[PDB]
Write a protein that binds this ligand. Sequence first.
Ligand SMILES: O=c1c2c3nc(n2Cc2ccc(Cl)cc2)Oc2ccc(F)c(c2)OCCCCCCn3c(=O)n1CCCO
Ligand SMILES: O=c1c2c3nc(n2Cc2ccc(Cl)cc2)Oc2ccc(F)c(c2)OCCCCCCn3c(=O)n1CCCO
Ligand SMILES: [Ca+2]
Ligand SMILES: [Zn+2]
Ligand SMILES: [Zn+2]
Lengths: 600, 153, 49, 51, 88
Amino acid sequence: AIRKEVVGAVELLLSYRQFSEFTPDITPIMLAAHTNNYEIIKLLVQKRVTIPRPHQIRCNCVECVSSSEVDSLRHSRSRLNIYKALASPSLIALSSEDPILTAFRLGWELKELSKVENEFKAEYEELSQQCKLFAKDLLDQARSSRELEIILNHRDDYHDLAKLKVAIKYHQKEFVAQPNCQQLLATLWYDGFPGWRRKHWVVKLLTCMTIGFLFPMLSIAYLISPRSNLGLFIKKPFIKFICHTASYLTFLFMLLLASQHIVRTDLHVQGPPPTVVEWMILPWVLGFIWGEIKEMWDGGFTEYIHDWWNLMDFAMNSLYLATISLKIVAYVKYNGSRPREEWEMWHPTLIAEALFAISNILSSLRLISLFTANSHLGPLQISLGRMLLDILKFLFIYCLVLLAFANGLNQLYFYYETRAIDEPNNCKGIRCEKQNNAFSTLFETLQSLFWSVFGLLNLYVTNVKARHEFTEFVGATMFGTYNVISLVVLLNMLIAMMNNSYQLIADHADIEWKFARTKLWMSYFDEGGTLPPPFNIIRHADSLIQNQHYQEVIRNLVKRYVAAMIRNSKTNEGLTEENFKELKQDISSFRYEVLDLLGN
Amino acid sequence: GRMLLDILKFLFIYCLVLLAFANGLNQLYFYYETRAIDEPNNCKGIRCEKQNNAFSTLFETLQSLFWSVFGLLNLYVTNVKARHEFTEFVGATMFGTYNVISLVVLLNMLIAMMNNSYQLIADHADIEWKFARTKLWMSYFDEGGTLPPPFNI
Amino acid sequence: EVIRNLVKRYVAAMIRNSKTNEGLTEENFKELKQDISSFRYEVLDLLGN
Amino acid sequence: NYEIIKLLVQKRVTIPRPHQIRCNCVECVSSSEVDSLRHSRSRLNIYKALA
Amino acid sequence: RDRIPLQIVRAETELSAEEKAFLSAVEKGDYATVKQALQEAEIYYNVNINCMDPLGRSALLIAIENENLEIMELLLNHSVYVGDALLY
Ligand SMILES: O=c1c2c3nc(n2Cc2ccc(Cl)cc2)Oc2ccc(F)c(c2)OCCCCCCn3c(=O)n1CCCO
Ligand SMILES: O=c1c2c3nc(n2Cc2ccc(Cl)cc2)Oc2ccc(F)c(c2)OCCCCCCn3c(=O)n1CCCO
Ligand SMILES: [Ca+2]
Ligand SMILES: [Zn+2]
Ligand SMILES: [Zn+2]
């Protein structure tokens, strides 16, 4: 009578206090929670009931290891039943003290259990989703602004968003991507600009360029006096972003002058003194290093190592730091002048110019981390991030298919290795004008097979001297078999897999960009007074009142949510065969009693 | 008309990926710039019979990287004189890293995005052509007496 | 006059289209049960007394 | 419904009028900073009624 | 202690056993018993006709969802409280 949801029968049976369809462990309070009635649950909790408690993961008591080896198919069924009982919206909303903070801590440890239990993965996964819509609905049942301000600023045990920071360390992407939460913030990220309803392409485009140039005077004004009317004008979430973005293009433009010399001296000395352009770049580097080392202090080291843009900065700083020592060693050791055509291959002045060239590439490709603040380029980085999880497995197969062939060819041609002096123009290997000696050693046979994918390798490299004709045919066959497997069978699969992979991330491509830009904005809200890089080197009653105010809103929200969810059912449900029989029985009993009365 | 609203963003990314690499190579080879008279047949730059001086200035390093997309650039342009061997390896590595990013990772995305973009404009493709031809026809209905161009003076 | 006629025809057609392409639900079953219930009660009241 | 609307218009009724876009009267700028989640709900209701 | 107790944290008011048969008779169509409870509550005072069931439904919002136009005219000839009943 609890599986078929009737209310009179339950009460009637309560008052009068070898084959079944139910396992021997189901209890009434546990079975009334798998279904989602609200009036039946309230009748069984007014009498005293109880639900058991499941042990933590990886527990090692004698019971958990004794029972798990006497019956192993019955011990893996009770836990699923208990976890399906505990995770129902009505039971959470009826007997919990804080219904919002209990769906955060229980929808996070129903996903860990989805990894150690490979049998019920789908089940646990789907139970983990009923705990993410509940809080979203309970939030969007609000009717005013004071209620939002009361809810989002509740701290258990000052006035900052002390409950919007807990939803980010649990990865709740539907609770922080809602109209009201995304409208309360935009009225704080645009403080000091009372109206953004301006011409889209001219006036709002020009005001920012106008603000850009003023960053040095703004910085020094904040430095000399922080409480004036010109100071305190930089402590706004937008101006700091503008100044920090503008302090970078100057650095990236003061490097193109060092690549192509505007005016310099001739190049014959071992080590020259640094020129004027180089004298002014060290402050930026020192400021970057100081900022990096300071950021690691007021923050978790584990939190630091969890961002993937940090290794780029580490490599850039290392390659920038090596150059100073490599340039001072040659200035102190060597002296004099000599032509450039007689230096050694391992001269300090030559190895100190390759790293400086390599560093510019890793320093210029970091302007792709700014695409999250725009509406057009935003959803493109999130769709590109998925494409890079497809090439790994095909790369795994390709590396084996290449290591396989890199040995056979090397084993066959290692008898006819000539020298350099006996060859025209004293050139040995590929990259000459007339290519030769392409399959001699193991290091060249790996570069030739790579360069032969684009088409820059000729066919007359398989013709050997000494008149032997049977070997050339085997070599040509081995070279021709490798092309069909790589150019015709593999590249026709990457396309067909990426095409399918792209048509599954197109949906929910706006819920993952707003989370990113919100996490971006939340970094400048705090008062840190971070100057640009160059200038960077110079009791009871309260708690009682809050807890008293926080409960009424919860009560009202719960009432409204319950009523709406009850109403939605009666309108969107169809009929079935169970209904027809009851009507037939009604007519039947009516007929029988009327005939009984009238006939006799 | 819809296909031409897809190449713009990939072009935006490609222009940055090209401006990034157009500097590193130029910064490394600008010490060995020879002259024209000291070269065979008095030809300097690419488009000769024997190509030379392809990474000297910033204007040539932008045309070489473009022409190297179709396959009309050879491999012996990265071999420098003066016997220095450590530089040639870095140059070859910088030249080989740029090809994988442009020929294998980007052209495999334009196809996969245009394929999806085409299967959403197939519907309602007859309501937008009749509007155009109606707007065309409505231009001659008025009495303007427009003679052909030659007799129009 | 043309507007009047067009409005009449459109309204009538839109009303007619609804009655044919709509399904049933749970609200309907309860009213039928109540009809039978009240009929029964009043008939028993009359006959028994 | 068509029959229910005709019964309420035979008695005298009225619907308010929404201001134009980018209006800058004292009311539109005073009310939009005392309660900003209630002022953005009435306009949607009126525009759903009129259409 | 391996058990979890359960209880109600946000309590509300409840109904007596004399104000329940009234609302139960309203939901079935019985017309001769409701008319007697409406008359006994004017000489003696034991029932208030403006009670509210667990879900916020009173005696006049149960007769609108089950379309009964003969109990509405009976409940209106006696003075009941008509609130936001024209929007339902
Ligand atoms: O020329 C070929 C070749 C070939 N498969 C071919 N041909 C063309 C050919 C056809 C007939 C003859 Cl009597 C001689 C050459 O054609 C086929 C014919 C039928 C196929 F089913 C097929 C390829 O595909 C099988 C898998 C590809 C193996 C390439 C080996 N393979 C190959 O390594 N060479 C290089 C030899 C260098 O002299
Ligand atoms: O030859 C290559 C090369 C390569 N990646 C390769 N190879 C082939 C190779 C393999 C092993 C060795 Cl010991 C030497 C050369 O192969 C791989 C091996 C594993 C990969 F995962 C992979 C590419 O893809 C990574 C992204 C592509 C980077 C191209 C750099 N890259 C490259 O710039 N050159 C140019 C050097 C000119 O001498
Ligand atoms: Ca950093
Ligand atoms: Zn256990
Ligand atoms: Zn307004």
